[PDB]
Design a protein around this ligand. Structure first.
Ligand SMILES: [Mg+2]
Ligand SMILES: [Mg+2]
Ligand SMILES: [Mg+2]
Ligand SMILES: [Mg+2]
Ligand SMILES: [Mg+2]
Ligand SMILES: [Mg+2]
Ligand SMILES: [Mg+2]
Ligand SMILES: [Mg+2]
Ligand SMILES: [Mg+2]
Ligand SMILES: [Mg+2]
Ligand SMILES: [Mg+2]
Ligand SMILES: [Mg+2]
Ligand SMILES: [Mg+2]
Ligand SMILES: [Mg+2]
Ligand SMILES: [Mg+2]
Ligand SMILES: [Mg+2]
Ligand SMILES: [Mg+2]
Ligand SMILES: [Mg+2]
Ligand SMILES: [Mg+2]
Ligand SMILES: [Mg+2]
Ligand SMILES: [Mg+2]
Ligand SMILES: [Mg+2]
Ligand SMILES: [Mg+2]
Ligand SMILES: [Mg+2]
Ligand SMILES: [Mg+2]
Ligand SMILES: [Mg+2]
Ligand SMILES: [Mg+2]
Ligand SMILES: [Mg+2]
Ligand SMILES: [Mg+2]
Ligand SMILES: [Mg+2]
Ligand SMILES: [Mg+2]
Ligand SMILES: [Mg+2]
Ligand SMILES: [Mg+2]
Ligand SMILES: [Mg+2]
Ligand SMILES: [Mg+2]
Ligand SMILES: [Mg+2]
Ligand SMILES: [Mg+2]
Ligand SMILES: [Mg+2]
Ligand SMILES: [Mg+2]
Ligand SMILES: [Zn+2]
Lengths: 144, 155, 150, 87, 81, 129
RNA sequence: GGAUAGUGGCCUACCAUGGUUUCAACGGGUAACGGGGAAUAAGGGUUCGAUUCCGGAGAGGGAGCCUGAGAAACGGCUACCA
RNA sequence: GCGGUAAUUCCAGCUCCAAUAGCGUAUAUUAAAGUUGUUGCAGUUAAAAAGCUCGUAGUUGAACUUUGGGCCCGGUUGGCCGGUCGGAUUUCCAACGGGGCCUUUCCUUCUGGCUAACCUUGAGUCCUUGUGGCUCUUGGCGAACCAGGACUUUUACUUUGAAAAAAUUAGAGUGUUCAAAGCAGGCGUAUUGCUCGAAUAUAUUAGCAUGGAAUAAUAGAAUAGGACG
RNA sequence: AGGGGAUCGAAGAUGAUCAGAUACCGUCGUAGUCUUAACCAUAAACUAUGCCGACUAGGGAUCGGGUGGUGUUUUUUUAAUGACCCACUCGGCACCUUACGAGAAAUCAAAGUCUUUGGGUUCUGGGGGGAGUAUGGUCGCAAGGCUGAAACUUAAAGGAAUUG
């Protein structure tokens, strides 16, 4: 019958053997080890607000060549420090150092986006406004 | 469990309000009180015959039986006047549409009227809390032994 | 099968349909049942008796002419050994194997053989013990085992 | 293969192997249809009049085409001996 | 093959088969009324002795044991019942 | 060691139906095997079977016809519960309109449909088509 | 025997050596209150339930107590800690 | 994967698609996933069979014991008729189930209480030449279950049923103008009221109640320390 | 830890080669190689393929056992023997041809009787790298054995076959 006990009374084996092999299930383990709560910069949360340290220019990974403009962010809830991308043309002029940006994921479950090495977060709003808004020009960046 | 002595306590053992006037000369000395606990269990004559006191006897004591009637194989007889049976049972795991062996060890009080050895199937009856753990009482012995006198020596 | 090797040897008695008979067999139940006990007392295992009576005598199968296995004939005649004969012949072997290993620690293969045998012994007894023929506690033991057969 | 009120629906009630009665299907371009001849009084062999047997591609493939034919044409009357039920 | 009588196999193909693998399995050893003319009264022997059978009165011999069938000693007759 | 005498009997049958034969010799018989081989012929999926009496445990000889695609057995004879019998037939019968799950009830070994008219239930034995 | 509204190692005295455990005791974790339920729709499942109803626990952390039919109450008190 | 001078991917203009009072994005989980596999995987070479064998826990485990035949009772669909002023039931027919019998056959058991049932019969007969039919006391049915004594080898499975919260789910009824809802509402003499409602199912593992006696266990008479009396 | 230490020979030293040449070839030769007492527990320890049971297909060899023969040869006086021949039958190590079947294929009488999916049972695997790494435990005189993660990284890595 290969493997599995087929017995009518062998339920315990069968449920337990499961419990076990579930651990090779990648996200099951992450979920039970609480990897989210433990590692990872965000709290397990969808977003995090934090503060800008330096403006960075990361050269793109092959076979691409460019310079991918990012901000080193120190998360508020957390202290943990994180590099994050400033998307679309310009935008990196909206930021300035020591500003208060809201970060968010990149939709790869961790896992850096593209030709950007080791950045796993993107910017959504500075100084409370929305990057998008500022890009277009529906809105203007606040005071100081 | 008991056996021997009967009056082997610091306290004098006796049934509550079962007076014997010494003025009135008798041939049985001590008048005894017993009951039929009902539910169809003969009160073994070794409760009536006996001399043990035991206020937790379902036949010669102030405990009363009611509620669950269970049966289990006797698995331990090491505590004075109370044993510990093991009721086993198969349990249904529905994802797998199969069962697994579980069990429980219900501790129960046993009246001198019965003599029990380990392995005997027993039938217990629920009663008031009698101790820290025991909520049942030995009410019938079903087996006997395990064909023990037919395990003897040589021809 | 072959419970302790990879042997697969179909090899057995092919025993008669004729659950009674043989008609060319004269004699009597008296005859054999007597004859059985003669060798019982002369000191033979039910097996050796079944074998002797099969060749010299015309005892095709001692049950067919006396509805009774030989070991039953013996037991009911108070001629039944302490322990079952297969358990005996087992133990006996494990002893002689052992006495070999005493003289030859250098023979790991004996060690191996010994284990197997005792493990047959040990499991066999558990049966005999379960079905009441050996006392609920009977044990085989290297120490005592050698004295047990002789 | 009927239908609600009578009515023989669904095309094609396919053939059937005489040996095994498993279905002779379409892309089975491997089976066979043997027509044996109905003879008459002295040698003459009544054309257009047959006793027939159809054998699956499978049977012919397993080599059982001959033996099974024997038994078929004999307990149908056109072989006397040759075949035997016991073996 | 493909169709046959499993119920009534032939007296010869049931012949050659193994002693267990026949239709209803049975023995194929036999029994013998064996004589060595020094005697008058003959003894019954099983075709596969094991025990080297001795005669009734005289400690003569009779047959000797082998792999299977016994070898009957020297000047002897027999029968199969 | 030999562990479901029934499951073997069904396999043999199936493998002689596949190999294009018309007779199987099956060993070692059993009450159940018959009362399975009974349901089979009762819906004419085999011909006639004969019990030969080795003084042992038995031998059956099934003459079959080839109407049968597959007889099969359920190895842990699960408990079926009156309404789940549809669910079984569902999973393993070829169509709504024929072939039976034969199963074991307190009131006889019987195809699922007879097991409906009588309105009983029990365990699941095997199936036929 | 005391204590309780009352059974009971609840507590005490005396006495015994017991009770649980691979059918997982005991220990650890829980970003754990439990249930009615919720989400996903072949089926089998997987995941979720702080949160309209039921039950439970708490009222900054602990303990103690008055009143009373009912509280170990906190929009009652007394103490210690913060 | 596009972008290094004709960019079908960038920045725009034009044009166009999809969804539309909504549409994107992040995170989570669910389906897709037969990539957790009871149903339902894979393990020669892709990831994966312990160097070998013993072996306890665990899971598993050959066949065999009331089978076959005969008789009775009354059900619920369906047919061929309809008798009738849409549906009706008797005779006819199958077919599918249920009950109780006799075949050597515990039905736990005695002690009456009881009887519903015929081996009865006491008359004869409505009426088709009569076993087509039931009222009907005076020899002869046990079990239908009362209740008291005396006693009961153990289970698993399965059927049916009780006991069961509502909202939620499934679902009937009803024109909230539709609908999500809601449990309303509907009829008149609308001048002194009539009236239908507020269903049903699920509810499981455990416990209880009960019908079953296949499958699967367990116990019994071998030093007879057997069984009926 | 003794004994042994012929042979070959990790280390080391040379002769050559080479741009180099800590090597490949040649020399020397320590430990080792063998053995007893006790360790160690690993090999591509391989058939890279769990065990028990059943079923499904053809052929010639052969190994062990057994049955059968007015077989051959051994001669003596026929026998008895023993070896040999032919038919069979278990049970071995295998090979052959097919393929009803299986597979991604290579190939496979099992790797077959599986979406027509259930005989019993044990074990292991769940993208690649990180890594058999850290860590704890445990075993060992050591060397090391067993048990054995995660962070992070990454779009392939891999298999069999085809054509070049
Ligand atoms: Mg792993
Ligand atoms: Mg930096
Ligand atoms: Mg905080
Ligand atoms: Mg004690
Ligand atoms: Mg084994
Ligand atoms: Mg075998
Ligand atoms: Mg043998
Ligand atoms: Mg102690
Ligand atoms: Mg565990
Ligand atoms: Mg919490
Ligand atoms: Mg809640
Ligand atoms: Mg929860
Ligand atoms: Mg919370
Ligand atoms: Mg409560
Ligand atoms: Mg409170
Ligand atoms: Mg505290
Ligand atoms: Mg308070
Ligand atoms: Mg309050
Ligand atoms: Mg241009
Ligand atoms: Mg352009
Ligand atoms: Mg554009
Ligand atoms: Mg959308
Ligand atoms: Mg299932
Ligand atoms: Mg896979
Ligand atoms: Mg591999
Ligand atoms: Mg291996
Ligand atoms: Mg191990
Ligand atoms: Mg069985
Ligand atoms: Mg129910
Ligand atoms: Mg409702
Ligand atoms: Mg040397
Ligand atoms: Mg060197
Ligand atoms: Mg040099
Ligand atoms: Mg060097
Ligand atoms: Mg290894
Ligand atoms: Mg190799
Ligand atoms: Mg072959
Ligand atoms: Mg010969
Ligand atoms: Mg790329
Ligand atoms: Zn003689």
């Amino acid at each position: 019958g290969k493997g599995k006990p087929r017995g009518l009374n062998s339920a315990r084996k069968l449920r337990v053997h499961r419990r076990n092999n579930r651990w090779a299930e990648n996200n099951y383990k992450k979920r039970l080890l609480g990897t989210a709560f433990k590692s990872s910069p965000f709290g397990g949360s969808s977003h995090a607000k934090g503060i800008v340290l330096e403006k960075l220019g990361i050269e793109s990974k092959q076979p691409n060549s460019a310079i991918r403009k990012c901000v080193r962010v120190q998360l508020i809830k957390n202290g943990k420090k994180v590099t994050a991308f400033v998307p679309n043309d310009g935008c990196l002029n909206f930021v300035d150092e020591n500003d208060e940006v809201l970060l968010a994921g990149f939709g790869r479950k961790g896992k850096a986006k593209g030709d950007i090495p080791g950045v796993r977060f993107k910017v959504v709003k500075v100084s409370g406004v929305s990057l998008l808004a500022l890009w277009k020009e529906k809105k203007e960046k606040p005071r100081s | 469990s008991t056996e021997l002595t009967v009056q082997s306590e610091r306290a004098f053992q006796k049934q509550p309000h079962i007076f014997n006037n010494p003025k009135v000369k008798t041939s049985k000395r001590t008048k005894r009180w017993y009951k039929n606990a009902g539910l169809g269990f003969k009160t073994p004559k070794t409760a009536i015959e006996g001399s043990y006191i035991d206020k937790k006897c379902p036949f010669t004591g102030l405990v009363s039986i009611r509620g669950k009637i269970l049966t289990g194989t006797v698995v331990s007889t090491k505590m004075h006047r109370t044993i510990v049976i093991r009721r086993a049972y198969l349990h249904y795991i529905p994802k797998y549409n199969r069962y697994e062996k579980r069990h429980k060890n219900v501790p129960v009080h046993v009246s001198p009227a019965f003599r029990v050895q380990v392995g005997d199937i027993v039938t217990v009856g629920q009663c008031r809390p009698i101790s820290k753990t025991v909520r049942f009482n030995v009410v019938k012995v079903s087996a006997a032994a395990g064909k023990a006198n037919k395990q003897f020596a040589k021809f | 099968g072959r419970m302790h090797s990879a042997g697969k040897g179909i090899s057995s008695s092919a025993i008669p349909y004729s659950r009674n008979a043989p008609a060319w067999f004269k004699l009597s139940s008296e005859s054999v049942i007597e004859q059985i006990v003669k060798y019982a007392r002369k000191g033979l295992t039910p097996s050796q008796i079944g074998v002797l009576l099969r060749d010299a005598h015309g005892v095709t199968q001692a049950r067919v002419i006396t509805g009774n296995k030989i070991m039953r004939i013996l037991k009911s005649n108070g001629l039944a050994p302490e322990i079952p004969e297969d358990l005996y012949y087992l133990i006996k072997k494990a002893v002689s194997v052992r006495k070999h290993l005493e003289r030859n620690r250098k023979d790991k293969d004996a060690k191996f053989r010994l284990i197997l045998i005792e493990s047959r012994i040990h499991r066999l007894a558990r049966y005999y013990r379960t079905v009441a023929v050996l006392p609920p506690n009977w044990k085989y033991e290297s120490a005592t085992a050698s004295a047990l057969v002789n | 293969m009927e239908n609600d009120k009578g009515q023989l629906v669904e095309l094609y009630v396919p053939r059937k192997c005489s040996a095994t009665n498993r279905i002779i299907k379409a892309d089975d371009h491997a089976s066979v249809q043997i027509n044996v001849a109905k003879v008459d009084e002295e040698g003459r062999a009544i054309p257009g009049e047959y006793v027939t047997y159809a054998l699956s591609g499978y049977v012919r493939s397993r080599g059982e085409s001959d033996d099974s034919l024997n038994r078929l044409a004999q307990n149908d009357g056109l072989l006397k001996n040759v075949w035997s039920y016991s073996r | 093959v493909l169709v046959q009588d499993l119920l009534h196999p032939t007296a010869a193909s049931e012949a050659r088969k193994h002693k267990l693998k026949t239709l209803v399995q049975g023995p194929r050893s036999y029994f013998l009324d064996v004589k060595c003319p020094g005697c008058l009264n003959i003894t019954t022997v099983f075709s596969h002795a094991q025990t080297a059978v001795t005669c009734e009165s005289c400690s003569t011999i009779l047959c000797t044991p082998t792999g299977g069938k016994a070898k009957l000693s020297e000047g002897t007759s027999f029968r199969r019942k | 060691t030999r562990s479901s005498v029934l499951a073997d009997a069904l396999n043999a049958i199936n493998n002689a139906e596949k190999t294009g034969k018309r007779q199987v010799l099956i060993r070692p018989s059993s009450k159940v095997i018959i009362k399975f081989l009974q349901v089979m012929q009762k819906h004419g999926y085999i011909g006639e079977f004969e019990y030969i009496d080795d003084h042992r445990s038995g031998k059956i000889v099934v003459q079959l016809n080839g109407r049968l695609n597959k007889c099969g057995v359920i190895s842990p004879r699960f408990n079926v519960k009156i309404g789940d019998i549809e669910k079984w037939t569902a999973n393993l019968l070829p169509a709504r309109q024929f072939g039976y799950v034969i199963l074991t009830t307190s009131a006889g070994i019987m195809d699922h449909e007879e097991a409906r008219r009588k309105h009983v239930s029990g365990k699941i034995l095997g199936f036929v088509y």
